[PDB]
From Swiss-Prot, chain A:
UniProt protein name: Small ribosomal subunit protein bS20
Protein species of origin: Mycoplasma pneumoniae (strain ATCC 29342 / M129 / Subtype 1)
NCBIfam families reported in the protein's UniProt record: S20 (TIGR00029)
Gene Ontology MF annotations: rRNA binding; structural constituent of ribosome
Listed GO biological process terms: translation
From Swiss-Prot, chain C:
Encoding gene (name): rpsL
Family: Belongs to the universal ribosomal protein uS12 family.
Gene source species: Mycoplasma pneumoniae (strain ATCC 29342 / M129 / Subtype 1)
Function comment: With S4 and S5 plays an important role in translational accuracy. Interacts with and stabilizes bases of the 16S rRNA that are involved in tRNA selection in the A site and with the mRNA backbone. Located at the interface of the 30S and 50S subunits, it traverses the body of the 30S subunit contacting proteins on the other side and probably holding the rRNA structure together. The combined cluster of proteins S8, S12 and S17 appears to hold together the shoulder and platform of the 30S subunit.
Subunit-level organization: Part of the 30S ribosomal subunit. Contacts proteins S8 and S17. May interact with IF1 in the 30S initiation complex.
Designated name of the protein: Small ribosomal subunit protein uS12
Highest taxon of source: Bacteria
Signal peptide: none
From Swiss-Prot, chain D:
Record InterPro entries: Ribosomal_uS4, Ribosomal_uS4_bac-type, Ribosomal_uS4_CS, Ribosomal_uS4_N, S4_RNA-bd, S4_RNA-bd_sf
Species of provenance: Mycoplasma pneumoniae (strain ATCC 29342 / M129 / Subtype 1) (Mycoplasmoides pneumoniae)
Keyword Ribosomal protein: yes
Subunit structure: Part of the 30S ribosomal subunit. Contacts protein S5. The interaction surface between S4 and S5 is involved in control of translational fidelity.
Biological processes annotated in GO: ribosomal small subunit biogenesis; translation
Family: Belongs to the universal ribosomal protein uS4 family.
Protein's name in the database: Small ribosomal subunit protein uS4
Entry keywords, A to Z: Ribonucleoprotein, Ribosomal protein, RNA-binding, rRNA-binding
One cellular-component annotation, GO: small ribosomal subunit
Keyword rRNA-binding: yes
Amino acid sequence: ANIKSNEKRLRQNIKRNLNNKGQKTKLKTNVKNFHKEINLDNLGNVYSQADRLARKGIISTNRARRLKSRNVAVLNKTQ
Amino acid sequence: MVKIRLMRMGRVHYPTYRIVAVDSRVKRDGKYIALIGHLNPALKENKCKIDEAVALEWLNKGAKPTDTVRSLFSQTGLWKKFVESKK
Amino acid sequence: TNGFEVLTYIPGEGHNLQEHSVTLLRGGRVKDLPGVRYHIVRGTLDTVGVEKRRQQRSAYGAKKPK
Amino acid sequence: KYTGSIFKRSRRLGFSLLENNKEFSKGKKRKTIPGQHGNRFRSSTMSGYAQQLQEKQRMQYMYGITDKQFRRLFRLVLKQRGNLAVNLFRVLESRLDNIVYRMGFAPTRRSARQLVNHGHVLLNDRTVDTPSIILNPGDKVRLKAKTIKIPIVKAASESGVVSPFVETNNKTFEGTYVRFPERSELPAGINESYVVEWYKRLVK
RNA sequence: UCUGAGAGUUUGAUCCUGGCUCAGGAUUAACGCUGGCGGCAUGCCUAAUACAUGCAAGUCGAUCGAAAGUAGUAAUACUUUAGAGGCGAACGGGUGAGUAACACGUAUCCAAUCUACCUUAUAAUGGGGGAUAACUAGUUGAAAGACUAGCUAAUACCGCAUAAGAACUUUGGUUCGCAUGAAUCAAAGUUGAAAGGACCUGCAAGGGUUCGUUAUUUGAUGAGGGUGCGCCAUAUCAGCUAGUUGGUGGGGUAACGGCCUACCAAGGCAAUGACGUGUAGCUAUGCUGAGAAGUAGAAUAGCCACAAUGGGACUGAGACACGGCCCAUACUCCUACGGGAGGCAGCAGUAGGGAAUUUUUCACAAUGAGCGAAAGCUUGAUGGAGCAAUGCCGCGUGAACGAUGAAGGUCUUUAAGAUUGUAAAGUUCUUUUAUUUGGGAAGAAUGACUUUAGCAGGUAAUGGCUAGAGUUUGACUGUACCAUUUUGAAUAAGUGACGACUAACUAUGUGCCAGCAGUCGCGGUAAUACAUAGGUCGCAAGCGUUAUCCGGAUUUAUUGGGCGUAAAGCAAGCGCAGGCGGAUUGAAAAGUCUGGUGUUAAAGGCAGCUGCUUAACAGUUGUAUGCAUUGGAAAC
Ligand SMILES: [Mg+2]
Ligand SMILES: [Mg+2]
Ligand SMILES: [Mg+2]
Ligand SMILES: [Mg+2]
Ligand SMILES: [Mg+2]
Ligand SMILES: [Mg+2]
Ligand SMILES: [Mg+2]
Ligand SMILES: [Mg+2]
Ligand SMILES: [Mg+2]
Ligand SMILES: [Mg+2]
Ligand SMILES: [Mg+2]
Ligand SMILES: [Mg+2]
Ligand SMILES: [Mg+2]
Ligand SMILES: [Mg+2]
Ligand SMILES: [Mg+2]
Ligand SMILES: [Mg+2]
Ligand SMILES: [Mg+2]
Ligand SMILES: [Mg+2]
Ligand SMILES: [Mg+2]
Ligand SMILES: [Mg+2]
Ligand SMILES: [Mg+2]
Ligand SMILES: [Mg+2]
Ligand SMILES: [Mg+2]
Ligand SMILES: [Mg+2]
Ligand SMILES: [Mg+2]
Ligand SMILES: [Mg+2]
Ligand SMILES: [Mg+2]
Ligand SMILES: [Mg+2]
Ligand SMILES: [Mg+2]
Ligand SMILES: [Mg+2]
Ligand SMILES: [Mg+2]
Ligand SMILES: [Mg+2]
Ligand SMILES: [Mg+2]
Ligand SMILES: [Mg+2]
Ligand SMILES: [Mg+2]
Ligand SMILES: [Mg+2]
Ligand SMILES: [Mg+2]
Ligand SMILES: [Mg+2]
């Protein structure tokens, strides 16, 4: 009633979830730090984490694009 | 991922094929997009009334043939026209 | 087999019904008795066939004399 | 699959298989409807349904046909161009076992069917076993060779008595057929055209 | 060029209104009687009831460590796979429970989207690091396993250098749009890649083919959203809706959006039917009809929804995942009593329900899929073979000769006679079927692979491209079919009806009793209507009965009916909305007509043709209907 392919796939996705969750948490904490003490310096780091995650697929590419566009709007308004 | 392939529409102990452009994930004997031409396992000669028109369009578009599908193209000579048009 | 009680005529001369028995009813409508609208298929399950019949047997259910 | 009392049914309708062999007979020269109730009154005034059904049986008993086969052929001929009153007559007379009897190679029609079923007949370029093939004038329906020697070939080879619509090239037993049968070769046993309308009501 | 049949029945008799019944087709059919075979097709309509047991998605050693086996003195050579990794498991298969609405059909706009592999084109594929499966050891157990500590490998993972082009912004131009708004720059800033494997050559260095990878580009397929129109019954369901209607800023989604959020408001739908109830998967189509249309949504094909019930999420290009994961409920089962296991609406099959619907089968041989360079491999999809007269089609139970009449049966026109009846008996003949003998295919009139020949690119080598040779492969299968092969009519006829509609009548028995019946109606001691018999008629390997749909039924009448006396004019009036509506002129062109283009999936429908011995059937070409857009016509 069980298939080795299905069992193996479940065992792999646990490890993938751990790694991807770590990457996603760094982006979350980084954008919150940025918008906390606003500073053009942070912005760069935001670009790096979002683009890297988008390539790997972890995050949908559109979400990175909207986050990128919207974060840059705050800087122009504040500068 | 259009794939020129066959579709059985004969009867018991008598197959009958039709060359047709269809997607890979569509079931055999289901829905398709364009008609190329029919086939008969026992037509002796001219067993594959080919079209020679849209088939070149779909192959140029990137259609992937099959082993038996390719075979038919070669005796008539359709493989030659496709490869020389690529060149 | 449902929950409907219907008065069904036993079509034939002589019956083995014993107040408690099983029958395989069919369609019909006897014109003499008001309310009866069904007929019992003869010679099928518990109900016996109609012997001593050589004419139109296929309907009453009797084994070919042979 | 057929009746084994052809005298009885021919005596009832009144018309035999066109030689009166089943009417003359060697006894009593009986021309009355069979059964005890044959010499009675109430002869004429058959209803339109009555005469139509009697006539319909005449057409389909002259050739040994089942009514369902008749309905198939009528459905076939019905659709084409128009007043096809010349086609279905050719269609009804195109039966393979019927042609062998008109060929003059069989003593009787249903005996010819038996020879057809047993494989003693051939066709232009193939062999035929089923006694229902619809023929078309032009096929060289050549006879068998091992059946020309059987202890019943004598009357079979006496095809000099033959209808003009079955040309044989006598003594060569080629046995083709052209010049489709006119109504003259289809005698007054069944020569009517409201049987077509009878099947028009019953068969679409 | 379409194209339509009626009859019986109220009365003493007639005409009309009017209801009932019948003559014809059809089905996923069932029952009774009977029963030989072949070619096609169909086969749980009920309990989306519960399921024993066995199968239904894997593949790559040419990604990687290790292990094992066989040879070898060794170095090593070959084979195999538990595990890591890639890819596929979201396709394919089944069922129709739910669903009355953008579910579906049709036409569309996505200036509001995604798309892995595949197509074209264009830059790169350099260099480091840290880990863990397998293994070892220990604890805990019968085992499943689980926990703990060390050891390793990469196309697993994580940094770094580098951007042809990318993404996000900045500067002003361009071309503009349908309101938000898109389109193109030149300059600049900011941000961001990966991995190698197989083989050949080369002393080496280096070079090369191919697979694969990252970043892009072109399309296409597939997925998603919105909108117009069409798409059940019911008023003996009149109000419904408080994220419901709108704006603002923000969040989220592939994307627009009360999808979500805080604030500000009070709207939205509804008699042209909201809301509620009941019912149902929708469509192409099947049956019926002259047609308009009625009816069921068999099989199959498109789309949607579901996977014991109800929720949530990971992985991924794509799932909120039939035979993946987590939780709860219900149910069953195992245990050594601590713990666990389970989802046949996948192929068979079992139990149960039912009037009722099949092998616990063979092979991937052909077609199709997934992985692989190939070898291959996996395929209850698929192709066959069983089963069943379930439906359509076809063939058989014999042929000739044979009594102005064998026997028997039934009537006797009380000797005669008829009738069954050329039927039989009897003489000859044949073997589709049936039983031996010999031959023996079609599908594989494909093929992938491997040695050769030639071309062809690049060339220093190898792969791709055609031809020939080979391994060439069958579940059906010693099957269809064939032959002068032995025997031989031998192995094969039932069912309904006979008063009228409706083709076909006599006797015996019974005596308003027993019984028949689709309708009128038969039976009260002379029954062609009951029972039996003889005869005869209608069908035939089928025949009747029952159930359902359509026609006939102009019997809900748009085509195509009526309201004085037969059903039907409200008791009458004032009357909004609705329907209809005098004459002439002008414009527009919503109806109306017509031309062009797109589409209306394939199968089916009708016509022609081909192939099965012809047919049934299969294939083949033709064949409309509607919608949208555009260009004209101006009579109503
Ligand atoms: Mg993702
Ligand atoms: Mg009367
Ligand atoms: Mg009828
Ligand atoms: Mg392995
Ligand atoms: Mg799965
Ligand atoms: Mg699925
Ligand atoms: Mg199927
Ligand atoms: Mg079902
Ligand atoms: Mg992929
Ligand atoms: Mg490494
Ligand atoms: Mg970097
Ligand atoms: Mg990598
Ligand atoms: Mg708003
Ligand atoms: Mg339902
Ligand atoms: Mg009509
Ligand atoms: Mg269906
Ligand atoms: Mg169904
Ligand atoms: Mg399952
Ligand atoms: Mg099953
Ligand atoms: Mg289930
Ligand atoms: Mg296969
Ligand atoms: Mg049948
Ligand atoms: Mg038949
Ligand atoms: Mg005889
Ligand atoms: Mg006698
Ligand atoms: Mg072969
Ligand atoms: Mg009776
Ligand atoms: Mg009687
Ligand atoms: Mg009717
Ligand atoms: Mg009507
Ligand atoms: Mg009227
Ligand atoms: Mg009145
Ligand atoms: Mg009045
Ligand atoms: Mg009144
Ligand atoms: Mg008024
Ligand atoms: Mg008004
Ligand atoms: Mg179509
Ligand atoms: Mg067909």
